[PDB]
Design a protein around this ligand. Sequence first.
Ligand code: VT8
Ligand code: CL
Ligand code: CL
Ligand code: MG
Ligand code: NA
Ligand code: NA
Ligand code: NA
Length: 326
Amino acid sequence: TLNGGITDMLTELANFEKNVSQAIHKYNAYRKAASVIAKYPHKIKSGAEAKKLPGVGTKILEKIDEFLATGKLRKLEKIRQDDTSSSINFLTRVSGIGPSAARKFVDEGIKTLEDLRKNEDKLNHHQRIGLKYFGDFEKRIPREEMLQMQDIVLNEVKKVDSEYIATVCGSFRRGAESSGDMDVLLTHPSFTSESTKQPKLLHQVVEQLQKVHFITDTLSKGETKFMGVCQLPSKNDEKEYPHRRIDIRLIPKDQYYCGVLYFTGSDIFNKNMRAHALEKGFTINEYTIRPLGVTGVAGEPLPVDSEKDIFDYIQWKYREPKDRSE
DNA sequence: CCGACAGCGCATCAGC
DNA sequence: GCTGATGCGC
DNA sequence: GTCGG
Ligand SMILES: Cc1cn([C@H]2C[C@H](O)[C@@H](COP(=O)(O)OP(=O)(O)C(Cl)(Cl)P(=O)(O)O)O2)c(=O)[nH]c1=O
Ligand SMILES: [Cl-]
Ligand SMILES: [Cl-]
Ligand SMILES: [Mg+2]
Ligand code: NA
Ligand code: NA
Ligand code: NA
């Protein structure tokens, strides 16, 4: 909020490059610049001052100078006025419509919420459910609701098998006062990097959450990742809660710490951390941290017994979840 | 200058 | 059907 | 769009 004007401008530029230009590197550059400026503990007085931060170069410095002098950016003012860019940007707000489908729909005259509704047969399943809950999926989730959702998910998982461990990650684990969705890390001792003693480990949990009418819709589902929709139950005569996005990730139990580091994020934090790992000669994914040889080929998984072990390998002081909101 | 930019599950489609 | 590329979203 | 080498 200290530099909220600038970071909003950069986020809108990032969205334009991703959604309209399909220029993924410009998208990530703008997001990195917005992240470093959001973290900067001073009210930026000039582009030159912002250029000192890593990820802000000459181009963004000049945009910041325009924004500070005038309160706006002509480039963005023209983008807002362009019907084609505005239409593509809007459609990507539906879950499952990305930049390519958005431009395909616009090209064939499908430009608004009603166009989508009257053309539901042009949508795949994910897009159909994203359209159905368009308004709901724009709402934030109060942390008090996240706590009730956690209670349901952990207890229903416990009812399936007491040896499951479900961990709510995402912004919730970083202590945020509100979240965009619910991310659940799941483990069971039957599923390790060495063996899967039991099938349908994820299915059984999903099935149970559907049975109690917590999970209401499916966006995608495989043996280790479920992405879908859920809803808190409401009380008598009470308006319903919005439907909410939920993601469940089943990770081999012996890879919990890499999985919980990954699912806790933020996404930019993970990108920064994984980039730094590469510079230190390691690669990090949600399963393992491995060394890189002189060929750059990933070696064998290093032993990991805590989140901090992962930080230790890349020579970073440990950062608590609440300081990973980048 | 310029190569690299984090890493991967699931859905869908083309080609065979 | 399988395989590989692409889209999308974490 | 930015940056390390
Ligand atoms: C999108 C994305 C995610 N994650 C990891 C890190 C992410 O933290 C984790 C969950 O993804 P989610 O999109 O739900 O991100 P949240 O942090 O929970 C959030 Cl603040 Cl955007 P909100 O959901 O509360 O609105 O997955 C990544 O590693 N890379 C990615 O590109
Ligand atoms: Cl690009
Ligand atoms: Cl791995
Ligand atoms: Mg989340
Ligand atoms: Na800089
Ligand atoms: Na979308
Ligand atoms: Na998520």
